[PDB]
Design an enzyme around this catalytic site. Structure first.
Site, short mmCIF file in Angstrom:
data_model
loop_
_atom_site.label_atom_id
_atom_site.label_comp_id
_atom_site.label_asym_id
_atom_site.label_seq_id
_atom_site.Cartn_x
_atom_site.Cartn_y
_atom_site.Cartn_z
N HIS A 73 12.91 7.00 -6.30
CA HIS A 73 11.68 7.58 -5.74
C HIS A 73 11.13 8.72 -6.60
O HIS A 73 9.90 8.83 -6.79
CB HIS A 73 11.95 8.05 -4.30
CG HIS A 73 10.75 8.15 -3.43
ND1 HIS A 73 10.82 7.94 -2.07
CD2 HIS A 73 9.46 8.47 -3.73
CE1 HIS A 73 9.60 8.13 -1.57
NE2 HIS A 73 8.76 8.44 -2.55
N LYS A 99 12.54 2.55 -1.74
CA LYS A 99 12.81 3.60 -2.70
C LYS A 99 14.04 4.39 -2.29
O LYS A 99 14.22 4.74 -1.12
CB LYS A 99 11.61 4.57 -2.84
CG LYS A 99 10.25 3.86 -2.87
CD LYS A 99 9.10 4.79 -3.20
CE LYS A 99 7.75 4.12 -2.98
NZ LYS A 99 7.39 4.04 -1.53
N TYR A 117 10.34 8.06 4.45
CA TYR A 117 9.21 7.98 5.37
C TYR A 117 9.65 7.93 6.83
O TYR A 117 8.81 8.16 7.71
CB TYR A 117 8.33 6.75 5.06
CG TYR A 117 7.73 6.73 3.66
CD1 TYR A 117 7.73 7.85 2.84
CD2 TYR A 117 7.20 5.55 3.15
CE1 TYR A 117 7.22 7.80 1.56
CE2 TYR A 117 6.69 5.49 1.86
CZ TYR A 117 6.71 6.61 1.06
OH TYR A 117 6.21 6.53 -0.23
N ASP A 162 4.85 -1.49 0.97
CA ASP A 162 5.51 -0.40 0.26
C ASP A 162 6.15 0.55 1.28
O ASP A 162 5.44 1.10 2.13
CB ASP A 162 4.53 0.39 -0.60
CG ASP A 162 5.24 1.47 -1.40
OD1 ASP A 162 5.91 1.12 -2.39
OD2 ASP A 162 5.18 2.66 -0.97
N1 LIG Z 1 6.07 6.92 -4.81
C1 LIG Z 1 5.63 8.02 -4.22
O1 LIG Z 1 6.12 9.14 -4.42
C2 LIG Z 1 4.46 7.90 -3.27
C3 LIG Z 1 3.67 9.00 -2.98
C4 LIG Z 1 2.52 8.84 -2.23
C5 LIG Z 1 2.19 7.60 -1.74
N2 LIG Z 1 3.01 6.55 -1.98
C6 LIG Z 1 2.71 5.20 -1.37
O2 LIG Z 1 1.33 4.93 -1.55
C7 LIG Z 1 0.73 4.70 -0.26
C8 LIG Z 1 -0.73 5.07 -0.28
O3 LIG Z 1 -0.91 6.48 -0.55
P1 LIG Z 1 -1.24 7.54 0.61
O4 LIG Z 1 -0.64 7.12 1.90
O5 LIG Z 1 -0.86 8.86 0.06
O6 LIG Z 1 -2.83 7.54 0.75
P2 LIG Z 1 -4.10 6.58 0.57
O7 LIG Z 1 -3.68 5.17 0.69
O8 LIG Z 1 -4.81 7.06 -0.64
O9 LIG Z 1 -4.98 7.07 1.81
C9 LIG Z 1 -4.51 6.85 3.16
C10 LIG Z 1 -5.51 7.51 4.07
O10 LIG Z 1 -6.79 6.86 3.93
C11 LIG Z 1 -7.25 6.40 5.19
N3 LIG Z 1 -7.94 5.14 4.99
C12 LIG Z 1 -7.37 3.94 4.67
N4 LIG Z 1 -8.24 2.97 4.50
C13 LIG Z 1 -9.46 3.58 4.72
C14 LIG Z 1 -10.77 3.08 4.71
N5 LIG Z 1 -11.06 1.79 4.44
N6 LIG Z 1 -11.77 3.93 4.99
C15 LIG Z 1 -11.47 5.21 5.26
N7 LIG Z 1 -10.27 5.80 5.29
C16 LIG Z 1 -9.30 4.92 5.02
C17 LIG Z 1 -6.00 6.29 6.07
O11 LIG Z 1 -6.37 6.45 7.45
P3 LIG Z 1 -5.73 5.60 8.66
O12 LIG Z 1 -4.31 5.26 8.29
O13 LIG Z 1 -5.85 6.56 9.84
O14 LIG Z 1 -6.61 4.38 8.82
C18 LIG Z 1 -5.17 7.47 5.56
O15 LIG Z 1 -5.61 8.69 6.14
C19 LIG Z 1 1.62 5.50 0.68
O16 LIG Z 1 1.43 5.19 2.05
C20 LIG Z 1 3.00 5.13 0.13
O17 LIG Z 1 3.31 3.81 0.56
C21 LIG Z 1 4.11 6.67 -2.75
#
Ligand SMILES: NC(=O)c1ccc[n+]([C@@H]2O[C@H](COP(=O)([O-])OP(=O)(O)OC[C@H]3O[C@@H](n4cnc5c(N)ncnc54)[C@H](OP(=O)(O)O)[C@@H]3O)[C@@H](O)[C@H]2O)c1
Length: 313
Positions: free
Chosen positions: A111, A78, A49, A44
């Site tokens: 997006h 997006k 980004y 994704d």
């Molecule tokens: N469409 C939209 O508007 C939108 C908005 C938000 C997100 N997104 C997408 O969704 C993805 C995921 O959401 P997000 O990045 O907000 O957050 P998330 O996936 O909920 O959390 C990411 C965080 O969790 C940590 N983490 C990952 N695996 C872990 C594990 N097994 N144990 C402990 N900590 C862990 C990562 O640390 P490290 O990386 O340091 O390991 C990072 O700090 C985004 O990257 C993006 O691709 C889209």
């Protein structure tokens, strides 16, 4: 638990993908390489980004190495809010394609439902700090997305951060040519989204859950905020199943027929997060996790709350 879900364009989408928001450009190439090496087939991405070039280096190297075939990958990006103009959509898509090293995207999303004034700034501001809107409505942006399918640039189109009424507005668009394939929305035990998920699924739109771990690296995190990974109630479910809390948080949306896109740049966690196809949460576990809802958002879109199409009123 099958690995892919059938979309309303006839293509299959892997239910687990790697997120890349906040993945530093100096770490995301290795993150994506590791992810593909350990089994991920869905990445994704987004232009906003600022790391698609580096994601693309990894994809291209794994294709060149013949670790995977292009047809086996499912790459999502997006359209950013400053490109909701008829004359800008194709170029925005092409910039993403050129950065990712691809000749098509599997899925391209609007997006946010909010269009902003085009220009260099991703959040163009008035002198008082409000985002400057575009007058292009979301139906005209949708028609521009449909063109991308008809030009071969993308295999599927969809939406992100659209509320129930905004999804309905596209579904009711006069002359609609392609329905959205996906609505990508925030979803986790503190923001369970039953109403919007039910509506989308009832219309054949697949939902992707973003921030499934509660985005502990979100830039605006505060110590007093709730923390999914540290919630003792969720840790207890994980312990019962001999899994990590993150693995429970990833399996949860999978069992709701959602796609889920946890982000990591840590190789061990990238691998951990993929090991979610070998255990099952009970119905009682699922209902218990759903009970933790409190309507709490990582991503409130706070820099566009004054826009007429702001989705979270
Ligand atoms: N469409 C939209 O508007 C939108 C908005 C938000 C997100 N997104 C997408 O969704 C993805 C995921 O959401 P997000 O990045 O907000 O957050 P998330 O996936 O909920 O959390 C990411 C965080 O969790 C940590 N983490 C990952 N695996 C872990 C594990 N097994 N144990 C402990 N900590 C862990 C990562 O640390 P490290 O990386 O340091 O390991 C990072 O700090 C985004 O990257 C993006 O691709 C889209």
């Amino acid at each position: 638990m099958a690995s892919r879900i059938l979309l309303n364009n006839g293509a299959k989408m892997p239910i687990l993908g790697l997120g890349t928001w906040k993945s530093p450009p100096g770490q995301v190439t290795e993150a994506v390489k590791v992810a593909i090496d350990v089994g991920y087939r869905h990445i994704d991405c987004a232009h906003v980004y600022q790391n698609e070039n580096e994601v693309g280096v990894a994809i291209q190297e794994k294709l060149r190495e013949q670790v995977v075939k292009r047809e086996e990958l499912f790459i999502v990006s997006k359209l950013w809010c400053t490109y909701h103009e008829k004359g800008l959509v194709k170029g925005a898509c092409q910039k993403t394609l050129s950065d990712l090293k691809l000749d098509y995207l599997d899925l391209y999303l609007i997006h946010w439902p909010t269009g902003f004034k085009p220009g260099k700034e991703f959040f163009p501001l008035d002198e008082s700090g409000n985002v400057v809107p575009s007058d292009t409505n979301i139906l005209d942006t949708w028609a521009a997305m449909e063109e991308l399918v008809d030009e071969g640039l993308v295999k599927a189109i969809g939406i992100s951060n659209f509320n129930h009424l905004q999804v309905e507005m596209i579904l009711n668009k006069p002359g609609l040519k392609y329905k959205p394939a996906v609505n990508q929305i925030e979803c986790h035990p503190y923001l369970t989204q039953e109403k919007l998920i039910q509506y989308c699924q009832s219309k054949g739109i697949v939902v992707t859950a973003y921030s499934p771990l509660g985005s502990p690296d979100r830039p605006w995190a505060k110590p007093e905020d709730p923390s999914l990974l540290e919630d003792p109630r969720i840790k207890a479910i994980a312990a019962k199943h001999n899994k990590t809390t993150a693995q429970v948080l990833i399996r949860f949306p999978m069992q709701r027929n959602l796609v889920v896109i946890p982000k990591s740049v840590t190789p061990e966690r990238i691998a951990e997060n993929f090991k979610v196809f070998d255990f099952e949460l009970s119905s009682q576990d699922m209902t218990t996790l759903l009970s933790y809802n409190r309507n709490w958002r990582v991503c409130g879109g706070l820099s566009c709350t004054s826009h007429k199409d702001y989705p979270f009123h």
